[PDB]
Amino acid sequence: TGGNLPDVASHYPVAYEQTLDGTVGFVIDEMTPERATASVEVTDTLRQRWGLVHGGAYCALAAMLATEATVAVVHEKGMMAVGQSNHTSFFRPVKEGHVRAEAVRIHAGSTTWFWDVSLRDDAGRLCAVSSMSIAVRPRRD
Amino acid sequence: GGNLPDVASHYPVAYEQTLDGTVGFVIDEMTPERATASVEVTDTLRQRWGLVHGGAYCALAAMLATEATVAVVHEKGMMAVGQSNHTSFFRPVKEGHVRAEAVRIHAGSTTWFWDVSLRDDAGRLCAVSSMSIAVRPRRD
Amino acid sequence: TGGNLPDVASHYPVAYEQTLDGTVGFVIDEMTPERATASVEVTDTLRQRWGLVHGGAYCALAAMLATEATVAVVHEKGMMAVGQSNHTSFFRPVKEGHVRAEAVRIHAGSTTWFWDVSLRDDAGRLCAVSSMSIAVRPRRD
Amino acid sequence: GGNLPDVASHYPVAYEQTLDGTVGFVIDEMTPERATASVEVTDTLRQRWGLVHGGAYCALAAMLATEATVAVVHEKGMMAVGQSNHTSFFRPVKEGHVRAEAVRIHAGSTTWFWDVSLRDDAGRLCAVSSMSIAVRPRRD
Ligand SMILES: CC(C)(COP(=O)(O)OP(=O)(O)OC[C@H]1O[C@@H](n2cnc3c(N)ncnc32)[C@H](O)[C@@H]1OP(=O)(O)O)[C@@H](O)C(=O)NCCC(=O)NCCSCC(=O)c1ccc(O)cc1
Ligand SMILES: CC(C)(COP(=O)(O)OP(=O)(O)OC[C@H]1O[C@@H](n2cnc3c(N)ncnc32)[C@H](O)[C@@H]1OP(=O)(O)O)[C@@H](O)C(=O)NCCC(=O)NCCSCC(=O)c1ccc(O)cc1
Numbered sequence: 160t161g162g163n164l165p166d167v168a169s170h171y172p173v174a175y176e177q178t179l180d181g182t183v184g185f186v187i188d189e190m191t192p193e194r195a196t197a198s199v200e201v202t203d204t205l206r207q208r209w210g211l212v213h214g215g216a217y218c219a220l221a222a223m224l225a226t227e228a229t230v231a232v233v234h235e236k237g238m239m240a241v242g243q244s245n246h247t248s249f250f251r252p253v254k255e256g257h258v259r260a261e262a263v264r265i266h267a268g269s270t271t272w273f274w275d276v277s278l279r280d281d282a283g284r285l286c287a288v289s290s291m292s293i294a295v296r297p298r299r300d
Numbered sequence: 301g302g303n304l305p306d307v308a309s310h311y312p313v314a315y316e317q318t319l320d321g322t323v324g325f326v327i328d329e330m331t332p333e334r335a336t337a338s339v340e341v342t343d344t345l346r347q348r349w350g351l352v353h354g355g356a357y358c359a360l361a362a363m364l365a366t367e368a369t370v371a372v373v374h375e376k377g378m379m380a381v382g383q384s385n386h387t388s389f390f391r392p393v394k395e396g397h398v399r400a401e402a403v404r405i406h407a408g409s410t411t412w413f414w415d416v417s418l419r420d421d422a423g424r425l426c427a428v429s430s431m432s433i434a435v436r437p438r439r440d
Numbered sequence: 441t442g443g444n445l446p447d448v449a450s451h452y453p454v455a456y457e458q459t460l461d462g463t464v465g466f467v468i469d470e471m472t473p474e475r476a477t478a479s480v481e482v483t484d485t486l487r488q489r490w491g492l493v494h495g496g497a498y499c500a501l502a503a504m505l506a507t508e509a510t511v512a513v514v515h516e517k518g519m520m521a522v523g524q525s526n527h528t529s530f531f532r533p534v535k536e537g538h539v540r541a542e543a544v545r546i547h548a549g550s551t552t553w554f555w556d557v558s559l560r561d562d563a564g565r566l567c568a569v570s571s572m573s574i575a576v577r578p579r580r581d
Numbered sequence: 582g583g584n585l586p587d588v589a590s591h592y593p594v595a596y597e598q599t600l601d602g603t604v605g606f607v608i609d610e611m612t613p614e615r616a617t618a619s620v621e622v623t624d625t626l627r628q629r630w631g632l633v634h635g636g637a638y639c640a641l642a643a644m645l646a647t648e649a650t651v652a653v654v655h656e657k658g659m660m661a662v663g664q665s666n667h668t669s670f671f672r673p674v675k676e677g678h679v680r681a682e683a684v685r686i687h688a689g690s691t692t693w694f695w696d697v698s699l700r701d702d703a704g705r706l707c708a709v710s711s712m713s714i715a716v717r718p719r720r721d
């Protein structure tokens with residue numbers, strides 16, 4: 160699968176290379192039911208005009224990583240998972256190198272899963288944290 | 301260039317190469333208390349399941365709120381940056397546009413706070429995103 | 441009903457005057473399905489040791505007001521409503537007088553309702569805002 | 582008096598009369614990077630349905646995070662106050678205790694950020710509450 164997203168269905172409405180994710184280059188490294196990690200190389204496509212990594216990039220990386228780590232478990236159970244809320248706090252700017260994300264599952268309820276995502280730069284500093292609440296619902300189709 | 305506020309003579313990254321230029325955000329109106337922006341939905345704004353990406357609502361809110369604060373404080377020697385964002389997703393968007401309206405609710409000496417509503421073509425509320433914006437002295 | 445909370449059941453596990461709400465003195469003024477208002481007189485019981493209204497008081501008032509405004513609609517439909525998340529931002533301290541809250545319903549989904557609560561002082565200044573997400577689930581008993 | 586940090590000679594409100602003294606919060610450990618507190622559940626901490634009040638988790642997180650920051654910055658001429666709190670409720674608590682553990686995750690010059698886990702007697706995670714704490718020069 161492109162970007163290493165979990166391969167859980169035969170076809171997807173939008174190919175990975177055309178999505179926001181494939182455009183900026185998000186890649187999943189490890190993925191388990193309780194923990195997943197992903198990273199992205201910073202290029203201008205991830206920056207805003209003042210030269211820092213965009214606020215939206217940290218949110219998008221957290222959202223994809225936490226939701227897909229959820230999809231990877233629940234999809235075969237006949238469920239979908241979508242992001243329901245995201246709370247992100249920005250501690251230090253990233254200007255270049257990579258952003259690495261580590262998502263840790265802190266609650267798995269029957270309707271809601273909750274993941275804490277830490278976003279670090281190449282020196283290992285904590286630049287942002289992003290909490291994701293993921294809704295889990297029976298598939299429609 | 302997106303109609304972002306033109307406050308400086310040079311910018312490190314050109315608008316068309318930024319995340320904002322890549323997905324196509326454009327500012328429509330901008331005043332100190334209220335700003336609006338919009339974007340057409342294309343695959344670049346979607347995730348693999350075909351819905352507008354969670355990141356895209358957050359990106360829009362953050363650019364709009366922060367640049368609407370830049371518009372006011374830059375000429376005063378201040379920089380403005382997003383410090384936190386809280387986004388809640390009520391209804392997905394599949395196609396058409398996403399239209400954002402940011403309303404300034406607090407303007408403190410060190411922090412401004414904006415509420416950003418994000419609506420689809422039918423005018424339905426699809427997400428809200430609160431942005432807290434830190435305002436600090438420019439570093440020379 | 442004590443504090444003017446919606447009267448939706450014959451008996452409640454804890455009487456109003458013994459609850460956190462009745463202890464600090466929260467009172468509901470208006471209540472509709474899309475809008476509710478409440479207030480509280482500030483006394484030391486609502487303050488922290490440095491003399492300001494406690495952070496917890498703004499959250500508690502928002503949580504009670506948004507959840508009960510939800511209970512008032514859904515209870516007779518056989519549902520319960522509980523607070524699922526709360527995000528509060530504090531703009532200006534309140535030292536005395538009253539805190540008045542106005543909750544406005546911004547989304548009513550089939551599993552989740554979302555209320556924005558503004559908290560003002562007696563001069564009408566906006567001192568805090570508190571977003572409440574309320575989960576709505578079938579009753580257990 | 583709750584074991585709060587004793588940083589000043591006089592406090593405007595005595596601990597037993599504060600919201601914190603009224604519901605019974607007590608600090609157990611406090612270091613610059615980590616603090617713990619607990620409270621017994623009584624009706625005063627509950628809402629009318631018999632569950633611990635949403636406000637009670639938020640109150641606990643906010644007092645603990647802020648006072649753990651006071652402990653460090655007060656002697657440096659700074660005051661600390663809660664600037665935002667985000668609390669998510671995973672499982673209700675009906676009786677027993679609520680035990681809070683606050684871990685400092687960022688300590689910036691103007692903002693500190695703490696994550697506070699709130700657990701019941703069985704040690705289950707019932708809520709988490711992130712606290713952002715503004716740190717500013719004391720006003721004389
Ligand atoms: C928000 C805040 C300024 C608060 O500061 P703090 O908690 O007191 O932390 P502190 O001030 O100790 O600084 C930590 C790092 O902040 C940076 N910083 C702090 N103050 C300043 C300043 N006055 N000038 C420049 N950098 C600063 C600096 O990198 C610092 O490290 P150091 O160089 O001092 O070692 C700091 O945490 C921070 O800079 N966070 C990152 C903000 C960020 O990166 N947000 C996302 C990007 S801007 C939002 C956005 O998406 C956008 C999009 C499009 C668009 O067109 C415009 C904006
Ligand atoms: C979260 C929730 C499911 C909760 O539902 P609710 O608050 O109870 O609202 P309700 O169920 O009344 O539904 C409102 C709308 O949600 C949709 N919805 C609700 N349940 C379902 C379901 N089981 N299946 C499909 N759609 C549903 C539906 O569109 C509905 O409108 P209608 O067609 O029923 O009129 C609904 O609010 C919602 O869908 N919010 C939008 C979720 C969203 O779009 N999040 C962001 C995108 S997914 C996160 C992400 O960024 C990501 C990125 C990359 C990647 O690879 C994976 C994910």
Ligand SMILES: CC(C)(COP(=O)(O)OP(=O)(O)OC[C@H]1O[C@@H](n2cnc3c(N)ncnc32)[C@H](O)[C@@H]1OP(=O)(O)O)[C@@H](O)C(=O)NCCC(=O)NCCSCC(=O)c1ccc(O)cc1
Nearest residue numbers: 408409410411488495530531532533643644647663715717
């Ligand atoms: C957080 C912040 C300091 C950020 O400031 P800002 O966004 O730049 O706004 P600005 O600085 O323009 O000031 C607005 C108001 O803030 C207050 N303020 C701001 N800076 C200061 C300062 N250095 N010293 C004293 N007051 C200040 C002041 O009242 C101001 O109005 P004015 O007198 O200047 O007209 C300001 O918004 C604020 O004070 N918010 C209220 C904080 C609050 O009330 N939080 C809850 C109480 S403390 C958290 C807690 O629950 C706790 C519980 C138990 C316990 O034992 C300890 C703590």
Ligand SMILES: CC(C)(COP(=O)(O)OP(=O)(O)OC[C@H]1O[C@@H](n2cnc3c(N)ncnc32)[C@H](O)[C@@H]1OP(=O)(O)O)[C@@H](O)C(=O)NCCC(=O)NCCSCC(=O)c1ccc(O)cc1
Nearest residue numbers: 268269270271503504507523577628634635670671672673
């Ligand atoms: C929000 C939610 C219902 C979502 O469920 P989820 O994330 O899918 O988790 P799941 O459904 O797996 O359930 C976990 C636990 O929640 C409880 N729960 C879930 N569904 C139900 C239900 N339909 N009925 C009763 N309890 C339920 C149950 O305790 C469960 O454990 P178990 O007994 O099933 O092992 C669950 O996370 C939860 O209950 N969180 C706690 C809610 C809470 O305690 N909020 C604060 C208090 S209510 C807000 C308030 O402050 C207020 C104040 C004054 C006032 O007058 C009114 C309200």
